[PDB]
Design an enzyme around this catalytic site. Structure first.
Site, short mmCIF file in Angstrom:
data_model
loop_
_atom_site.label_atom_id
_atom_site.label_comp_id
_atom_site.label_asym_id
_atom_site.label_seq_id
_atom_site.Cartn_x
_atom_site.Cartn_y
_atom_site.Cartn_z
N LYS A 272 38.59 60.81 -2.12
CA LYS A 272 39.23 59.50 -1.99
C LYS A 272 40.39 59.32 -2.99
O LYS A 272 40.24 59.70 -4.16
CB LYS A 272 38.22 58.40 -2.37
N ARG A 346 27.22 57.15 7.72
CA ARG A 346 26.62 57.26 9.03
C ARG A 346 25.60 58.40 9.01
O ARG A 346 24.73 58.41 9.87
CB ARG A 346 27.69 57.44 10.09
ZN LIG Z 1 32.40 57.21 2.33
#
Ligand SMILES: [Zn+2]
Ligand code: NI
Ligand SMILES: [Zn+2]
Length: 494
Positions: A272, A346
């Site tokens: 990120k 998920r």
């Molecule tokens: Zn993530």
């Protein structure tokens, strides 16, 4: 033991030092307000006339009457026109006015509830608005830096047992919300999966719920490959937190609530950016939602069964973290290709959902701060929803309509399942791209749902807020805790 509650219904104004009065844009006063006006030699009329006090919706005017009267402060809150006035106007009127009282650092307050009732909003309802909105507005961020309001009297001429009942539910909802805000605002080094598991245990004790907390080794034995893949890069151990509340004589029609409990999201090997990783302590927002809602259910003991399942772990880089292109065997036995390690949520929800199903869930709601895409699709103030069952979705939508927390459905189509099934190596693809970003994550989860009526809620945008509002500080919002709670009140099976 007669324990004192913060919110108290009375027929008498015992504590007139600090008052809260609603004003409609009628052009005469009546009830208490009229008496007050006279008691004040027509001052209130003059102030309205001159616009120093306003009945315009959400205007707050503070009047300090002469000491001769028994009153020090009056907080007038404008309510607009009575023809347009609704419950959720009440919520906002209370929020605006206790924002101001919280600033003023006042300890005791008498609300003249009746000045807030109308055709549309009866006393019991106004009462609910008051306690819930009060608790949300006056919440403080639990900080680690180097006054409190403790009595609110709802003064009314209506049934006290009923009004008090409203105050009590109002207060339960606010309390669970604020709980969730707390968990969410907590710095990640202050809230590991382990800390999250203590919190759950404390909650389980307090409200006498069944609690089980699965550890790594049991997860290995059971084959929880989703949750274990995400945890591979961690030294902080994982937890699958399970809470059982059986409020019906038969463990059946069980409502499964699954929360994403990623305690910190670095994004893993698919790293990120510098700006994107700040605030990722809030990636357990979904877990906050469900824990917040368990607290509410524990307080209101509804006649419903609820299984809460929270897969919990941090998502980290190390010599052993999951890698793009890895293939993994979920709990369900479905294989997943990891195209993107930042789509870790998920993976854990998939195990959570299969577990819930294995443990008798007969409907499901998952809550996750799951995708940036939802923010692009719907903004920061509208939670996204996906479902595999319109009937059950209607129940969830109506819950959200009662909650006051806005939800909007996004489609899962066959083309969508085609994309998620498109993996060269496995059954499922954990990250097909930015196109229908939020729907890809919903679509993936619904494969684990199979036939069980299910709703997925993406609160990546609604779980936090940049700025304070009438209804609480910047940071965590505790979104969805209410809606899940209401759903368990209102839920009836097929
Ligand atoms: Zn993530
Ligand atoms: Ni008293
Ligand atoms: Zn995440």
């Amino acid at each position: 033991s007669h324990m004192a509650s913060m919110f108290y219904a009375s027929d008498q104004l015992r504590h007139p030092e600090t008052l809260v009065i609603g004003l409609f844009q009628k052009s005469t006063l009546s009830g208490f307000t009229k008496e007050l006006d006279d008691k004040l030699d027509g001052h209130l009329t003059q102030l309205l006339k001159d616009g120093d006090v306003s009945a315009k919706r959400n205007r707050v005017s503070k009047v300090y009457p002469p000491a001769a009267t028994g009153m020090k402060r009056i907080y007038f809150i404008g309510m607009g026109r009575e023809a347009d006035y609704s419950f959720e106007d009440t919520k906002e009127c209370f929020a605006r006015v206790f924002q101001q009282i919280h600033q003023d650092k006042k300890q005791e307050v008498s609300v003249l509830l009746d000045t807030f009732v109308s055709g549309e909003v009866p006393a019991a309802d106004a009462a609910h608005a008051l306690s819930e909105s009060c608790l949300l507005a006056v919440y403080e961020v639990q900080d680690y830096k180097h006054q409190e309001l403790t009595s609110v009297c709802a003064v009314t001429e209506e049934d006290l047992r009923e009004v008090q009942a409203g105050l009590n539910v109002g207060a339960a909802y606010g309390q669970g919300t604020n709980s969730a805000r707390t968990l969410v605002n907590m710095p990640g080094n202050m809230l590991t999966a382990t800390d999250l598991a203590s919190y759950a245990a404390e909650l389980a004790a307090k409200y006498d719920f069944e609690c089980e907390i699965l550890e790594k080794d049991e997860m290995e034995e059971l084959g929880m490959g989703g949750l274990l893949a995400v945890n591979k890069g961690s030294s902080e151990p994982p937890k699958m937190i399970v809470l059982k509340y059986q409020g019906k004589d038969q463990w059946e029609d069980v409502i499964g609530l699954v929360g994403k409990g990623i305690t910190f999201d670095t994004g893993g090997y698919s790293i990120k950016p510098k700006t994107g990783i700040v605030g990722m302590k809030s990636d357990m927002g979904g877990a906050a939602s469900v824990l917040g809602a368990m607290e509410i259910i524990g307080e209101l003991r509804p006649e419903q069964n609820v299984l809460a399942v929270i897969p919990s772990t941090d998502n980290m880089i190390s010599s052993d973290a999951m890698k793009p292109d890895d293939v993994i065997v979920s709990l369900s036995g479905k294989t997943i290709e990891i195209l993107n390690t930042d789509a870790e949520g998920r993976l854990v929800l998939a195990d959570g959902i299969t577990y819930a199903k294995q443990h008798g869930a007969s409907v499901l709601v998952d809550v996750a701060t799951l995708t940036g895409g939802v923010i692009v699709a719907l903004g920061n103030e509208m939670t996204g929803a996906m479902t595999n069952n319109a009937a059950f979705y209607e129940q969830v939508a109506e819950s959200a309509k009662e909650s006051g927390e806005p939800i909007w459905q996004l489609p899962i189509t066959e083309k969508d399942k085609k994309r998620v099934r498109n993996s060269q190596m496995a059954d499922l693809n954990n990250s097909p791209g930015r196109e229908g970003h939020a729907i890809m994550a919903g679509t993936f989860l619904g494969e684990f749902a199979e036939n069980t009526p299910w709703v997925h809620l993406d609160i990546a945008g609604t779980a936090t807020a940049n700025k304070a509002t009438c209804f609480g500080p910047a940071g965590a919002t505790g979104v969805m805790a209410r809606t899940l709670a209401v759903l368990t009140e209102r839920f009836t099976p097929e």
